[PDB]
């Protein structure tokens with residue numbers, strides 16, 4: 001019999017994830033079905049989103065050769081029935097206070113920083129780049145978390161050194177670019193561009209660097225359709241563009257500039273969005289989501 005979630009202590013919540021204490025050395029990492037758009041957590045959950053993204057993350061952990069925080073199988077008996085398929089048993093680490101970001105393409109705050117200063121996180125880039133420009137090699141563009149409502153703050157390598165030490169900072173940079181490069185090449189082979197990605201790392205008892213949280217999900221990474229990649233314009237979000245289009249379209253009744261909470265999504269948009277998550281997962285993993293564990 002699986003334990004109840006209420007047997008564990010809630011220790012953290014994010015926009016679309018939760019974290020629980022299992023015992024002194026283990027946590028339960030939980031993905032929810034909530035979806036964020038335009039910095040709002042939407043009223044409408046996406047069915048199976050937590051399970052699909054957990055399946056995605058498990059696939060990528062398996063693809064990468066680096067140490068990670070997984071501490072048991074996806075069906076580990078310590079996982080409650082209620083979150084089965086969308087929760088992982090992980091080992092407790094001393095987390096490093098750095099959002100480790102790799103960018104293979106120039107968009108978002110990376111693009112904005114470049115347009116303002118000609119540089120991103122200390123990297124002075126060539127002139128003449130623009131929206132969705134390819135970056136070669138990929139850039140380590142670290143960030144720090146700010147207050148609850150605020151976006152992460154982009155910082156340079158010196159700031160990372162100041163946070164975790166000189167040798168550790170080099171390690172974070174090197175590993176972030178190495179595993180991004182591997183995952184991005186794999187995804188592109190399958191027809192999906194991973195334009196960028198965000199990791200957190202922790203340290204175990206022996207001082208080893210360990211990859212944590214969720215990895216290479218559409219929440220942690222921008223997924224683009226490679227078949228429609230067109231430098232110079234904003235790329236469609238592989239997973240969220242239906243949601244985005246409806247909210248900012250003539251049927252929502254919502255003004256994005258209002259900064260007021262957006263309305264609930266049409267059921268049809270939520271179902272279509274679920275289909276996009278499954279498509280992305282099955283294309284990248286080569287597996288069937290129908291085989292992924294659930295309640």
Ligand SMILES: N#Cc1c(N)ncnc1-c1cnn(Cc2ccc(F)c(F)c2)c1
Pocket residue numbers: 012013014017018019027029069090091092093094095200202212213214
């Ligand atoms: N993963 C992991 C982990 C670990 N293996 N050992 C120690 N601490 C962490 C840990 C602590 N915070 N976070 C970020 C995070 C995740 C999920 C949430 F819901 C959330 F609010 C905040 C990760």
